[PDB]
Design a protein around this nucleic acid. Structure first.
Ligand SMILES: [Ca+2]
Ligand SMILES: [Ca+2]
Lengths: 98, 94, 79, 103, 103, 95, 98, 79
DNA sequence: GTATGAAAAAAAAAATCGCATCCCGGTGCCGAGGCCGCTCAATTGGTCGTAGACAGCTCTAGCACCGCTTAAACGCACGTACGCGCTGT
């Protein structure tokens, strides 16, 4: 019964997604989220299809970024596994929270 | 030559809010910088708001929108208010 | 409650692009939180640009002008 | 004076001049400088208020820089506004991460 | 055409118009728009050159976004210039911290 | 329709100059478009400030230069400063 | 003889310097450094006394800042001692180097 | 070689204000390095503002305009 | 492989001590607070032109329909590497 050891697939998954540029969130669930969040600030709003994608682009990019910085915070603690406390540090230093 | 500030106005506003308290020149310089900074921040954003909608005229409406973008929540509401107030009161003064 | 529409495996993806090898379960929620905060802070301004234009439809430009404001400037949507 | 019509101390005239001369746009709505001048005044006030308190707590009649910093950094909102801003002779809010304390 | 006097492809005329109409200053030195247009052209070139190479290395006749990112992010200088800039359909430079690789 | 001006024809020309036998996707063109407009605004802005700082009402090729020195990294500036000084000289001497 | 245990003074030194605002680098050695560095970009320059102090203010502030962020990077590695690698992280995340 | 005029104990001070309890010896040099890079990057621009004004004396304002450019805005010296 | 009970070891608690910050008054000086002349920039109010305010036409493209095919998502559990905490140089 053939099995790849914990991590081997992860390392593959990385190479794979680093090499590509395609958006990694499913477009509708995101579009629905955007509109949900829009209703907070005004009701019955409409969105240019491009304005939705424009957001999704920024978000994914931003997060990937944060994870990059997060991963370093983790590693810096002799750890291979990112944890909330790692993100929390990154943002603190980035100057996103206090 | 004549170096314009905002230090006399700060003084007036200081007495309004704390009559029996003063301010060091160093601190006044800071408050001076502070105003000029926020001015430029708003003016700039307004100027852009204008340029974005093809307007040549920056109204009190543009200033407002800018402030909403630049200031944090509660500080905006108060700023938006103290601004709306002064406009209404000036338009009704002639 | 669309924030859960950001599926564990989709975040996994994003972190894999970030070069993350191993991911604590607590993360997935933490992430959703940060994403919400992000989209919130952006859209707020983005809408605020729309509301100034007296439009009921958000433009790509509205988004760009905002992302530019939040020091996260975007090329490819007509900056 | 336009300032006395709007009920402001801050100079609505000086503002209106700075805006035209500032290369922000060709034309400037006579309402703008009023609105702005008020905002500036409000904020100026909102700071000096907090600073004036910080001064009292130090038993001082005169506001020095440190007071402004102490005021701005303790108020969550003013802080976020003055994020990338350094305040001459500011110092920093006494803060010592717990894990550094003894016992 | 002013562009053909300066030996540029980029539109020195269009630039000069954008500068006056852009609320940057009252008056605009006829030399400025030339200078600027050239800079823009140079930079535009400096990117497209590197991108054109990145395209060849992927065995592609057409430059897509990824190529621009791959080009900009690998050149130290262009990167520093485009620090706070997101490139649509950019992706990221393959980069896997060594300590994550197996032994 | 609208009449929405770009920079995409110039990019094309410059593309052929540098890589004759290579093209460009619309997506990428949009980026290059944004890129120009960005740097424009960065320079114009800094220049506008340079003017306002020295009490000048006139933004000359001199202001543009100083701005570029401040905005661009070393080697990229030198090249930009050069390719700019060149184009001014060459235009002034073309009548 | 009476002796305070390693760190007890440090903790005192902190409280002390946090509370004050006076510049912690010696004014002349700094002024001399500034001018030294200025000569790289142009010779026979002069400096407004204020322009010198203005720099020293920024620098000290900046460094204090970096140390703040640095100290967190150290702590994040279960460490009380800041090390070069801590600064290096902070800057990386701050976006000062690569 | 004025960079050594930034004395170990003066850096110690700065890190103490930064809330640092304990400091590796390697730091002191590292710091000097970062400080140099900082002052370099700032003054360069600061001088570049002077050179544009055709002055041979650097003003406080020259410094401020620069620090403002390098997203490190300074109050108490005008501007 | 898991609950009894008494000497190693490791931490708490409490009396000398001495050391360094905190609060009082008392001394000196220095730069904040208000007086003058002086100027520049604000008010006043008409001269003129243009922005935008206003109502309407084009068409755009953003919202809702459908039902199938599909991969992605949800879930389980099995077991190995990654964490985490202890000790000791
Ligand atoms: Ca609807
Ligand atoms: Ca708080």
């Amino acid at each position: 019964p053939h099995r790849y050891r914990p991590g081997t697939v992860a390392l593959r998954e990385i190479r794979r997604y680093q090499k590509s540029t395609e958006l990694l969130i499913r477009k509708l669930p995101f579009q629905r989220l955007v509109r949900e969040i829009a209703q907070d600030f005004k009701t019955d709003l409409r969105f240019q299809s491009s304005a939705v994608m424009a957001l999704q682009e920024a978000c994914e990019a931003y997060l990937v970024g944060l994870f990059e910085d997060t991963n370093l915070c983790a590693i810096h603690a002799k750890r291979v596994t990112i944890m909330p406390k790692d993100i929390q540090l990154a943002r603190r230093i980035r100057g996103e929270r206090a | 030559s004549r170096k314009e500030s905002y230090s006399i106005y700060v003084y007036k506003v200081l007495k309004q809010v704390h009559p029996d308290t003063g301010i060091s020149s160093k601190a006044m310089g800071i408050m001076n910088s502070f105003v000029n900074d926020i001015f430029e921040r708003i003016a700039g954003e307004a100027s852009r708001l204008a340029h974005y909608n093809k307007r040549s005229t920056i109204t009190s409406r543009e200033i407002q929108t800018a402030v909403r973008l630049l200031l944090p929540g509660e500080l905006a509401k108060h700023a938006v208010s103290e601004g709306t107030k002064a406009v209404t009161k000036y338009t009704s003064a002639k | 409650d669309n924030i859960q529409g950001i599926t564990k495996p989709a975040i996994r993806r994003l972190a894999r692009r970030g070069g993350v090898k191993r991911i604590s379960g607590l993360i997935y929620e933490e992430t959703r939180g940060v994403l919400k905060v992000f989209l919130e802070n952006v859209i707020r301004d983005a809408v605020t640009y729309t509301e100034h234009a007296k439009r009921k439809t958000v433009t790509a430009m509205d988004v760009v002008y905002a992302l530019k404001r939040q020091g996260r400037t975007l090329y490819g949507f007509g900056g | 004076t336009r300032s006395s019509r709007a009920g402001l101390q801050f100079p609505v005239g000086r503002v209106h001049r700075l805006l035209r001369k500032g290369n922000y746009s060709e034309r400037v709505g006579a309402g703008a400088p009023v609105y702005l001048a008020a905002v500036l005044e409000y904020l100026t006030a909102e700071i000096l208020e907090l600073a004036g308190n910080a001064a009292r707590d130090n038993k001082k009649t005169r506001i020095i820089p440190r007071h402004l910093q102490l005021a701005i950094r303790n108020d969550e909102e003013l802080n976020k506004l003055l994020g990338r801003v350094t305040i001459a002779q500011g110092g920093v809010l006494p803060n010592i991460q717990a894990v550094l304390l003894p016992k």
